[PDB]
Ligand binder design. Structure first.
Ligand code: CNC
Length: 34
C-alpha cells in the first residue's frame, strides 16, 4: 500500500495526519485494531 502523504504545514502535526492515514489504510485492508 501507499497512503496520503503530507509536507505543507508543520512536522509533528503532519506526522499525526500520516499516522491517521496509516491506521485508516490498515483498517481498509487487514483485521488488526487500534
Ligand atoms: C521516500 O523514501 C520518502 O522519504 C522522504 N523523507 C521523509 N522523511 C525523511 C527524512 C530524511 C532525512 C530523508 C533523507 C528523507 C525523508 C519523503 O517523505 C519521501 O516521501 P514521498 O512520498 O516521496 O514524498 C512525499 C509526497 C512528501 N513528503 C514530504 O514532504 C516530507 C513529509 C515529512 C512530514 C516526513 C514523512 C512523511 C516521512 N518521514 Co521524515 C519523518 N518523520 N523521516 C523519516 C521517515 C519518514 C517516513 C518514511 C515515515 C515518512 C515518509 C512517508 C511519505 N511517503 O511521505 C526517517 C528517515 C528514514 C530514512 N530512510 O532515512 C527520519 C530520518 C527518522 C524519523 N523517523 O523521524 C525522518 C526525519 C528525522 C524527518 N522527516 C521529515 C523530513 C518529515 C517531513 C516533514 C517536513 N517538514 O518536511 N518526514 C522531518 C523534517 C520531520 C521531523 N521529525 O522533524 C525530519 C528531517 C530532519 C529535520 N530536518 O528535522
Amino acid at each position: 500500500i501507499x497512503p496520503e502523504a503530507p509536507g505543507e504545514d508543520a512536522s509533528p502535526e503532519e506526522l499525526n495526519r500520516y499516522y491517521a492515514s496509516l491506521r485508516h489504510y490498515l483498517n481498509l485492508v487487514t483485521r488488526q485494531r487500534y
